């Protein structure tokens, strides 16, 4: 009988960075029907399907007849995790960021292309809103990227502080999506903490989202174990040494801590190289209300919006040499749809609390 090439299944998982055994199994089985009459290839809207169907057709037919499908996929997903282990030790942090940027640019080429449904002007309206959230926003994003790539001990964490609806959660989520990584919850007791801290294994950055303090009930701020927990994770935050994570011995990822207006102990404050305070701006909330596509299409939380922001404001030299050709094609695309004049009109509209797109 015919033998399935485990190596070809592995190659597909590697090309698509597949970390889910069931997702790989499902995607591979979907290559078993003739590409000539494939409606999915014809629609050309899922690159992980249409760019691989022809190369994997004959092997996928054999795979459909296999009595050992889960094992084939488990080896393929293990090889992807093995590659991630190698890269976490050999790749420079700049190459890691280039890899994430190429991933976001692939999505961008799809959603804003001939077979996509995203509206580029809507994302650019998102860029304008984000550029109004803080002064020198392109520099704030750029200085954050440099802090994450350089990963300097004791100078690797930023504190985002402010009430709800201040944009702190949105910007931290957008930054996490731009760099790739995980959001953690440290509001649990120390007993459960180590398995949550384990979520940081081989991650480029982390966000300790919505960390809570105590005795702030008189200000209507909920109680939690977060601030105390963080105050006891100086080694995780400092990144001076490798920590023993459980779920690897590695430097805990750098990142962001977001929190409401709680009292920050002197010891925990010393852990942050920077603190950005987010305050409610009526015009930002009003403009967002008038530009519902931003909320509906989850634009403000997107790393593609921050990459678009960076491509709009920064020259080709501000990007690593390996992505120069993609930045050039994207700058040409943005010039066709918006000008510095119309971009400035969008920002004036945000400032007035008016719809961003006229």
Give the residue ranges of the annotated binding site for ATP.
162-169
41 touches Zn ion by CB under 5 A: yes
CB 252 within 8 A of CB 202: no
- How far apart CA 212 and CA 209 sit, in angstroms, is 9
Which span (123-131, 179-187, 325-333, 342-350) binds a copy of itself, by CB under 8 A?
179-187
Measured N-to-C along each axis, helices 69-90 and 6-16 cross at an angle, to the nearest 10 degrees, of 50
70 touches a copy of itself by CB under 8 A: yes
Annotated binding site: 49, 53, 162-169
Which span (120-128, 146-154, 306-314, 321-329) binds a copy of itself, by CB under 8 A?
146-154
30 touches a copy of itself by CB under 8 A: yes
Work out how close the CB of 40 gets to Zn ion at its nearest, in angstroms, rounded to a whole number.
Answer: 4
Q: Strands 274-277, 255-259: parallel, antiparallel or unpaired by DSSP?
A: unpaired
Q: Which does 53 bind (CB under 5 to 8 A by kind): Zn ion, a copy of itself, none?
A: Zn ion
Q: What are the structure tokens assigned to 165, written together? A: 């609806």
Which span (34-42, 143-151, 284-292, 321-329) binds Zn ion, by CB under 5 A?
34-42
Place of tokens 């998102």: 126
- Where does residue 188 fall: left (phi above 0), alpha (psi -120 to 50 degrees), or beta otherwise? beta
- Of 275-304, which residues contact a copy of itself (CB under 8 A)? 295-296, 298, 301
In 305-328, which positions are buried (b, 16+ CB within 10 angstroms) versus exposed (e)?
Answer: bbbbbbbbbbeeeebeeebeebbe
> DSSP for 207-272?
EEEEE--SS-GGGTPPP-SHHHHHHT-HHHHH-SS-EE----EEPPP-EEEEE-S----HHHHTT-
Q: Which residue in the set 40, 91, 201, 290 belongs to the binding site for Zn ion (CB under 5 A)? A: 40
Query: Which residue number, 113 or 136, has a Cβ lying nearer to a copy of itself?
Result: 113
Residues of this chain that interact with a copy of itself (CB under 8 A) are 6-7, 20, 22-23, 25-27, 29-30, 46, 64-67, 69-72, 75, 78-79, 81-86, 89-90, 150, 152-155, 164, 169-170, 173, 182-183, 187-188, 190-192, 199, 209-210, 220, 222, 224, 231-232, 234-235, 240-241, 244, 266-267, 295-296, 298, 301
């Amino acid at each position: 009988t015919k033998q399935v090439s485990w190596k070809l299944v592995t190659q597909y998982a590697l090309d698509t960075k597949c970390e889910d055994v069931f997702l790989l199994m499902g995607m591979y089985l979907n290559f078993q029907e003739a590409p000539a009459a494939c409606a999915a290839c014809a629609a050309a809207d899922q690159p992980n399907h249409f760019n691989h169907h022809e190369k994997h057709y004959y092997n996928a037919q054999i795979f459909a007849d296999s009595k050992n499908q889960k094992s084939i996929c488990q080896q393929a997903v293990d090889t992807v995790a093995a590659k991630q282990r190698v890269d976490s030790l050999h790749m420079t942090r700049e190459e890691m960021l280039v890899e994430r940027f190429n991933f976001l640019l692939d999505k961008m080429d799809l959603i804003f292309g001939a077979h996509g449904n995203a509206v580029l002007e809507q994302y650019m309206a998102g860029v304008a809103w984000i550029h109004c959230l803080l002064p020198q926003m392109d520099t704030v994003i750029y200085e954050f990227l440099k802090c994450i790539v350089l990963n300097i001990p004791k100078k690797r964490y930023w504190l985002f502080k402010g009430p709800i609806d201040s944009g702190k959660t949105t910007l931290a989520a957008a930054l996490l999506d731009l760099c790739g990584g995980k959001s953690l919850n440290v509001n649990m007791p120390l007993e459960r903490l180590n398995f949550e801290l384990g979520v940081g294994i081989d991650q480029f950055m982390v966000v300790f989202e919505d960390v809570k303090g105590t005795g702030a009930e008189s200000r209507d701020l909920p109680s939690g174990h977060g601030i105390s927990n963080l105050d006891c994770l100086r080694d995780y935050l400092d990144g001076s040494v490798k920590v023993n994570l459980e779920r690897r011995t590695q430097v805990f990822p750098p990142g962001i801590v977001t929190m409401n207006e709680y009292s920050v102990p002197r010891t925990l404050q010393a852990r942050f190289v920077r603190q950005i305070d987010f305050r409610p701006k009526a015009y930002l909330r009003k403009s967002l209300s008038c530009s519902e596509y931003l909320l509906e299409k989850r634009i403000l939380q997107s790393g593609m919006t921050l990459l678009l922001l960076l491509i709009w404001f920064r020259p080709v030299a501000d990007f690593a040499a390996a992505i120069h050709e993609r930045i050039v094609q994207w700058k040409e695309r943005l010039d066709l749809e918006i000008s510095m004049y119309t971009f400035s009109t969008m920002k004036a509209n945000v400032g007035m609390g008016a719809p961003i797109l006229d």
